[PDB]
Amino acid sequence: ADYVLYKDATKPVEDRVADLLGRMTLAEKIGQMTQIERLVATPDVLRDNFIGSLLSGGGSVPRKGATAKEWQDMVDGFQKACMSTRLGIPMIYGIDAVHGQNNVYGATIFPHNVGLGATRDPYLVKRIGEATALEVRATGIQYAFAPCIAVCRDPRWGRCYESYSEDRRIVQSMTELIPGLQGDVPKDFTSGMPFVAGKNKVAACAKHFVGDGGTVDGINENNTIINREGLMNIHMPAYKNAMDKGVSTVMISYSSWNGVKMHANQDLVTGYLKDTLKFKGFVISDWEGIDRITTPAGSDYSYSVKASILAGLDMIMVPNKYQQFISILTGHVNGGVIPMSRIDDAVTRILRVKFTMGLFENPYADPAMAEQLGKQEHRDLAREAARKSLVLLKNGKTSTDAPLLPLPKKAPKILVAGSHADNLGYQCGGWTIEYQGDTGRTTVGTTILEAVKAAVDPSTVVVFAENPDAEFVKSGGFSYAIVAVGEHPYTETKGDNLNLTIPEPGLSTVQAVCGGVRCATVLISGRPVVVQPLLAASDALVAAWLPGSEGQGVTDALFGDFGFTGRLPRTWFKSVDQLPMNVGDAHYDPLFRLGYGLTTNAT
C-alpha cells in the first residue's frame, strides 16, 4: 500500500505523468516550471521551492579546470536535494553543449555548425550528437540546449557560426544531430512526441523558435523578421524535421515575428508549435527572455510572467531571480489570471520529458561515464569533422601553377605563422570554456602548429613565427609556409566586427609570408569575411571556419592524408554593401557561390 503509480517504472509515461500531476500542489507545479542557474542554487532553495530544473549558463562552472567527476558531484548534490522533496521529482540539468560539451575543461570541441554545414554530411553530424551526449553525460548533465537550427540570413550576425547554412535545406538535413543526442526514435513514432532513449543519451533542444536567423543586418536583435512565406519556408521547416525526430524541447527566441515578441507569441508557440506540429515536449524560454518582452527589459515582470505563460511557454529560464518568478506566477494563478489548465499543461510536458528520458529511474550520474569526457575516439571524430569542413577556395595563383596543396611532409625547413596557428581559443571560437571564447590553451586540444609538428617527416625543421616580417621569411630558406589568421572569438553582442574584416595583423602577416615563400593560408572564421586581399596574396587558401579542438583535421587535408571535400554552406560576398545576399536573391552576385569548393585527391 506504499505503492505509488508514478514511481513504478513499468507503467506507461502518460499514466505516470497524470498520477503524479494529480498529487501536486500549486507550489510544486510552479517549481517544475522554474529553471535556475547553479550560481543561485542551494539544497534549501531547490528543496523548499520544488525546483524543476537547473542550468549552467556560458562559463558557469564549479571551478576552473573541474574534472568530469567534480561536475558529476555538483549535479548529484543538487539532485539529492530535489529527490528529498515530498514528491521526489528529479531536476533536469541543462547546458549549452553546442559543439561538444564546450563549457568543460578537457571536453572534445567539435567544429561549429557553419563548418558542419560545409561537410554536407548529416550522418557525421549524427555521430557528433552521439559523442556529445556521452561527454555531457560524463559530467552528469542530462540536457543540451542544441541544435541551434537558425537559418542565418546575414553573416554580420554574431551567431552566424551557430547556423549550419543560409540554405534551410542544409539546416533541415542537419537536424540529424537530434537522434544523435537523444537516440533514434522507435518505428511506430508520432511526430511531435518527445524522445530520449536512456541514460547514455540526453534531451535536445531545437532553438530558437522562430526566425532567429532572420534579417536585419545582421540579425542581432531586431524583430529578425520577414513576413509569411519568409517563415513557412525559410525559418520554420527545420522545426518540423525536429518534430519528426522527437526533439524533447524547444527554446523560444528573443526576436519577434510580425512585431510580436516570440516569448509572448501565442499564435506561433501554442497555435502552430503545439496545436499544429503537435509538439508534446516542453517549451523553454531563453535567458531572461520573458523580461525582454517589455521595453525596457524587466520593467514589468508581472506582465512578462503573464504574457509568456499565456503564450504557451512551459519552463522559464529565469534564471536568477526565482523568488520573484515564483511569487508572481503564484499570484496570477491564485487570482485566476492564469488558469490551472495552463499550469497543468506546462507541468504535464515537463514531466513527460522527465519520465520518457528515464530521469526518475536514473536521477544520478554514472561514475563510469566520466572517462567519456575528451575520450580519444571522440577526438578522432572531431578530427574527421574538422577535416571535412575545410573549404579549399584557391589552390595555385595561375592556371599554369603547380597546385600547392597537398604539401609534402618531407622538406628541409618550413614556416608556420600567423596569430591563429598556435592558439586553441581562436580555433574553437565562441561558446568555448565560456560564454565568449578565450585565447591560448584553455582546454586539451592540438593547435595548427602542434598538428604540423605531429604530421611532418622527422627531418623536416618546423619554425614557428607569429608575425614574422618579410625579411625573416625571405632569409629563412623555407620550402613553404602555412599561415593561419582570422577572426577573434565572438557572439551576438560582444566582439562582433560588422565590417567582416579580419583583425590586424592578419592580412599583413599573410602578405609578408606569402611575399617571400609559397604559402597555404588557413582562414579561421565564423563566417565569410572580406577575403580578396587574402586570396590575391595566397598561393592556396582554406576556409577552416571554427574547427575546434582537433587541429590535426586541418593538417590532414593540407598534407594530403585525405582530399578536400568541403563546400561553402554560405554565399561568399564580394563586399559587405551587398548584404543581405543569399542564394536565390534577385541580384545574386557572389565572389563564391554557395556550394563552391575545390578538391584534391589523397596522396
Q: What is the 3-state secondary structure (H, E, C) of 13-77?
A: HHHHHHHHHCCCCHHHHHHHCEEEEHHHCCHHHHHHCCCCEEEECCCCCCCCCCCHHHHHHHHHH
- 58 and 188 housed in the same domain: yes
- 343 and 406 housed in the same domain: no
Q: Please, what is the angle between helix 301-311 and helix 322-334, to 10°?
A: 70
Q: Is the bond preceding residue 480 a cis peptide, omega within 30 degrees?
A: no
DSSP, collapsed to helix, strand or coil, labels residue 336 as coil
DSSP, collapsed to helix, strand or coil, labels residue 230 as coil
Q: Report H helices in 151-269.
A: 168-173, 177-182, 237-244, 266
Distance CA 509, CA 35 (A): 47
Q: 568: closest CA among 155, 125, 79?
A: 155
Q: Report H helices in 104-176.
A: 113-119, 122-138, 168-173
Q: Is the bond preceding residue 406 a cis peptide, omega within 30 degrees?
A: yes
- 482 and 367 housed in the same domain: no
Q: Which of 374, 406, 424 is the last residue of a domain?
A: 374
SS (H, E, C) 548-565: CCECHHHHHHHCCCCCCC
173: containing domain: 1-374
DSSP β-ladder status, 34-37 and 256-257: unpaired
Order the strands of the 205-209 sheet from edge to edge. Answer: 205-209, 249-252, 282-284
- Positions annotated as catalytic residues are 286, 492
The number of folded domains in the chain is 2
- 435 and 327 housed in the same domain: no
In a domain, 366, yes or no: yes
Distance CA 94, CA 37 (A): 10
Distance CA 43, CA 75 (A): 11
DSSP, collapsed to helix, strand or coil, labels residue 207 as strand
Q: Which of 358, 374, 390 is the last residue of a domain?
A: 374
Burial of 493 (0-12, 13-18, 19+ CB in 10 A): exposed
- 348 and 402 housed in the same domain: no
Q: 386: closest CA among 561, 180, 213, 513?
A: 561
- 298 and 246 housed in the same domain: yes
In a domain, 159, yes or no: yes
DSSP, collapsed to helix, strand or coil, labels residue 498 as coil
Q: Which of 322, 341, 374 is the last residue of a domain?
A: 374
In a domain, 594, yes or no: no
- 72 and 181 housed in the same domain: yes
In a domain, 599, yes or no: no
Distance CA 222, CA 207 (A): 17
> CB neighbours of 429 closer than 8 A, spacing ≥ 6?
112, 161, 437, 487, 489, 490, 524, 526, 546
DSSP β-ladder status, 540-545 and 391-395: antiparallel
Cell numbers linked to 573: 560576398
Contact between 213 and 224 (Cβ < 8 Å): yes
CB atoms within 10 A of CB 272: 20
- 299 and 228 housed in the same domain: yes
Distance CA 166, CA 151 (A): 5
Residue 426 phi/psi, 5° resolution? -70, -35
In a domain, 596, yes or no: no
Distance CA 163, CA 570 (A): 10
- 266 and 133 housed in the same domain: yes
In a domain, 582, yes or no: no
DSSP, collapsed to helix, strand or coil, labels residue 162 as helix
Experimental method: X-ray
CB atoms within 10 A of CB 300: 14
Contact between 442 and 424 (Cβ < 8 Å): yes
Q: 280: closest CA among 353, 388, 386?
A: 353
In a domain, 146, yes or no: yes
- 380 and 473 housed in the same domain: yes
Q: 478: closest CA among 447, 502, 456, 504?
A: 456
In a domain, 423, yes or no: yes
- 476 and 334 housed in the same domain: no
Q: Report H helices in 156-294.
A: 168-173, 177-182, 237-244, 266
